[PDB]
Amino acid sequence: MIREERLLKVLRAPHVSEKASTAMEKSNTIVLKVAKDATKAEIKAAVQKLFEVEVEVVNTLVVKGKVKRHGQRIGRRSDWKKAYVTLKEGQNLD
Amino acid sequence: AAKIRRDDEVIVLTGKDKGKRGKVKNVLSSGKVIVEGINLVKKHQKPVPALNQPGGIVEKEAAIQVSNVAIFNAATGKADRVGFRFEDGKKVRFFKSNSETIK
Amino acid sequence: KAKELREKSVEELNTELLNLLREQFNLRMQAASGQLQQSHLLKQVRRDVARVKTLLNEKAGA
Amino acid sequence: MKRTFQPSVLKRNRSHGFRARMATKNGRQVLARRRAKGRARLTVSK
Amino acid sequence: SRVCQVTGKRPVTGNNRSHALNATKRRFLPNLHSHRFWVESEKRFVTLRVSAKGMRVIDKKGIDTVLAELRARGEKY
RNA sequence: UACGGUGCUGAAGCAACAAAUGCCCUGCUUCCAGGAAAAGCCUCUAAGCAUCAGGUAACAUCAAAUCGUACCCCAAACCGA
RNA sequence: CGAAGGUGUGCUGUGAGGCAUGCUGGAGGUAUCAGAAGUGCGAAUGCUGACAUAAGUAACGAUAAAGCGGGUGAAAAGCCCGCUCGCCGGAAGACCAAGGGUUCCUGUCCAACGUUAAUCGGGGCAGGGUGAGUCGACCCCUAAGGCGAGGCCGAAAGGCGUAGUCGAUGGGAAACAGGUUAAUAUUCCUGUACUUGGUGUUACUGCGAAGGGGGGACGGAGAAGGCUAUGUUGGCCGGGCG
RNA sequence: UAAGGUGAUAUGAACCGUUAUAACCGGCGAUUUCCGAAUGGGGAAACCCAGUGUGUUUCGACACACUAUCAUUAACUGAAUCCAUAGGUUAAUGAGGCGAACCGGGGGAACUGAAACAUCUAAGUACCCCGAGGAAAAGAAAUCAACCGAGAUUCCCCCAGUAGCGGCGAGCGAACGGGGAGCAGCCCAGAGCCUGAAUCAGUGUGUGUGUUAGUGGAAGCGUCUGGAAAGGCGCGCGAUACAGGGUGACAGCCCCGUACACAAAAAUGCACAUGCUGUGAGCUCGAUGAGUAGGGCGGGACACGUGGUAUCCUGUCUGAAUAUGGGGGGACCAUCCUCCAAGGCUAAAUACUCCUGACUGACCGAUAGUGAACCAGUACCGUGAGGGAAAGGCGAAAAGAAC
């Protein structure tokens, strides 16, 4: 049982990319940016409540931040957690 | 306690537009005002495809120091200095010369 | 808004907070896409939430 | 030719890392000194 | 640590002076000894690492008094 | 046919011989220089509990989180400026 | 109506120097007589920066090796495609650990970086990319060793060490084949599996550990025999008739 | 406090706000991830893994609190062993770590000087360690003095480079006494009377005065040069304000300020005033700090190196008298003088500046001044401790050069 408030905080964004699109189309799997602390179960819960859609399974991974250079000064982008969430057969997501 | 404000008509004490007049357009945190029609510069605006800008020699209003302008008193027909005083529990500006309140 | 929200119960407050959170979430969802063309909204919502939280704390043991 | 530095992360940490430094008085002193100096990287710890 | 429990005698530093006055640092340890002292009131032996001077003091005063003093000082025995 | 590829389709698919330093082998034979530990695992009971829990029996269901996963790796990416 | 500074000129003093003035410069300077000194540089194999010399000289980092056609382009010995040639093949191939930490893939740019050119790049910029119950870590267990309640010892700091607790390089449950991405895969998909936990069950009925026992649990060398990986030949199947 | 705002490189976007919950500034609150004394256990810091309890559940799980060690006190429990004690489990209170210098204590060099070198010097310095405070330490005569007297400690100037010490070398170097800064004295070794009597600490209240935002705050125009006037030349005015900074060149009167006069809902420092809690004052009688003082042996400190060496401290072995007594007066004795050790407390004058504010400089002005005017303890170097740079200036205004 995850708290409503917690759930709302978990899910950061949808992730747009070719791969993501492919996943959505073929495998019925949505690619989300989620909180770095968000566990799989929590993510699933969030998905179910907040998008109103049955979840088969969630795979997560941590994306490491790229090191960049703004002019002369070096600086690193933040790490962030990506989640492939596979929706059950016949579940169409808006 | 700022003697010149957004909608005041001012007269210029110094510079190329000295003697001229104009309504303050806006006042900057740096201690400079931009007055309508006074200090003009012919900026060469570089075109950009986005934002629908054609780009040309645009004549715009550059800033001027607040110290360089003065609040004009319509009655005297001259530039004046501004003082502050409390009328009915509320601070108000007044012309030093003639002692009348700014309204 | 704090003076208005101060005249409320705990339960009432909680619901409001929840609503605010939901709104924020929605905004975030929109923001990520090209839907939200009113960025200040997000800023507002967070502030509101914070205020609500503060109020709650004041009520419960202060 | 086998050169002197032959890196190993665990070894480095055990040797020089924060916890090791903390463990002893001299280590602590070193840390303090570093702090005083204004070092950004107080220890070898990543 | 070589410390008489009754008297508080620690080691103190000093010199060996030779015949040619060659100072070299040395210590002066106290004449410590662990000794079981019979405590007549409690009816048990209390072991104390004590100097010969400490022993003498005890003899003079009474072990009980010494014990009390120690207690006051916050010292286990 | 975006000359990158994509979609459909698809025969036979056996036998003999040779064969490891790999496996049986944590084996066997032998030698003296005489060859880790602890848990998992199996088992025995004590205090206990006593007709409850616990144990094994299948069956149902739920569970398995977290972090790593790119790329180089006898090297142009590591140690040698 | 042009300060200091810079740079010429003229005059002047026995000298250190001084005065005047053209150009440059664009805002400070300072008589006099006193006062105080970070008060004068050619040398210290002085210190810092700049710039020479050798000199457009040596070298351009394995003597595995190139040639041509087409493409793109401002431009092609070097990039892409093609056909030849050559080199490695117990490696100069493939997969990992360690270590690195985005170098991966795509688009784009060629100032600098690349010992030449560069359209190319491990270079610049932007975007994308790392999916696990069963692989590894974590986790349970311990070795060498470390820390170590009390404790023993020590001017202080601290040393040693019991109970314990950490410590892999060792012991401990479980997944395979195929397909797929520009870039991940025993992680995605397809098929077919396995594991050990709870919870609930009906069925039964001695369970229970910080303890006992077993097991785990182990050397070198040698010898075979049985195997498979793998390879060869034949058969088969498809294509071929130079 | 406000008419302007949403920190900076750094614009833009989307917005808020204008007479008062925009923004800004100050008081008191709230929130305050993880690591770090780090404290539930562990650990390769910013990570891994728990236990217990209280609530919830859509019954998959959640949440949030507590759980270090030591010291001390209390409660319960509890061996060998009868009672006990050790031990054990809880509970409460405190501690822990960091920090410039200064301060007290525990340890403690060498280079060097002596033209070598060993006593000696350097020096109780550097350094290490423990502890404390805004200061610390010391402190209320068993002190000096000299037959006159002084009257706790600390600090400054003299005394004096004197007297001394000293391989009588190199060097070290007082005191008495005088002038100043500041000055304060108290309690326990114990019981009688009287009973709340001075003082101190914590803690409320009241007053005064700071501090932490602030408010008002004088008086100038014309003309010439010029890109621009604050400059020149005219004629004015303010000044308890001609400190300083800015403004298109040098401004008392353009701006910000300055002198001067005012200001605090709230928090808080310091003075007195006062309430409450603890603390006991004055009087009489006494009592008057023993392994101590001294001594021997060994060291150390005293300017004083064992010397003819007083005095202090003590590792070691001894060991009085106890006011009819004892200490000291620089070997020692006698006389006299002077003080009362072996229990404590104590403000001031003194030391220092990581830090805050204000002001000043015959201090520097980018190879100077901090290492660092600049995103510097950074880049870079090093396994690590550690080392450690370079680099300021367009213009008045970006008007930063459309085509």
From Swiss-Prot, chain D:
InterPro entries listed in its UniProt record: Ribosomal_bL34 (IPR000271), Ribosomal_bL34_CS (IPR020939)
Similarity comment text for this entry: Belongs to the bacterial ribosomal protein bL34 family.
Keyword Transmembrane tagged: no
GO molecular function annotations of the record: structural constituent of ribosome
Source organism, top-level taxon: Bacteria
Species, as recorded: Escherichia coli O45:K1 (strain S88 / ExPEC)
GO CC, alphabetical: ribonucleoprotein complex; ribosome
Keywords noted in UniProt: Ribonucleoprotein, Ribosomal protein
One GO-annotated biological process of the protein: translation
Lineage start: Bacteria, Pseudomonadati, Pseudomonadota, Gammaproteobacteria, Enterobacterales
Name by which UniProt lists this protein: Large ribosomal subunit protein bL34
Pfam families (alphabetical): Ribosomal_L34
